[PDB]
């Protein structure tokens, strides 16, 4: 909730990177289900979350 309030309303997608990183801190790595959950919370298409997950090298997909 506090992550999402750092950005203008109507631009929740800005929270994808920090929220995706949070999912990895809770879980250690990002299963495809975690990527889908992040996409659901922020209401962005799941593909736009896969692109971020595979673009940035700090996300562990195994």
């Amino acid at each position: 909730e506090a992550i999402v309030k750092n950005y203008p309303e109507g631009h929740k997608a800005a929270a994808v990177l920090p929220v995706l990183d949070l999912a990895q801190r809770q879980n250690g790595w990002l299963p495809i289900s975690a990527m889908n959950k992040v996409a659901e919370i922020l209401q962005v298409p799941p593909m736009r979350v896969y692109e971020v997950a595979t673009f940035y090298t700090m996300y562990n997909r195994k």
């Binding site: 750092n6 631009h11 997608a13 800005a14 929270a15 994808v16 990177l17 920090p18 995706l20 990183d21 962005v44 736009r48 692109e51 971020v52 673009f55 940035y56 090298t57 700090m58 996300y59």
Partner: peptide
């Protein structure tokens, strides 16, 4: 404060903006 996720290209000024907006840098 917004943290990156591992990408040298995100230092580029416009790529940095795209990353803040939640896209590939």
């Amino acid at each position: 404060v917004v943290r990156g996720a591992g990408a040298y290209i995100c230092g580029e000024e416009t790529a940095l903006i795209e990353s803040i907006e939640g896209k590939q840098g």
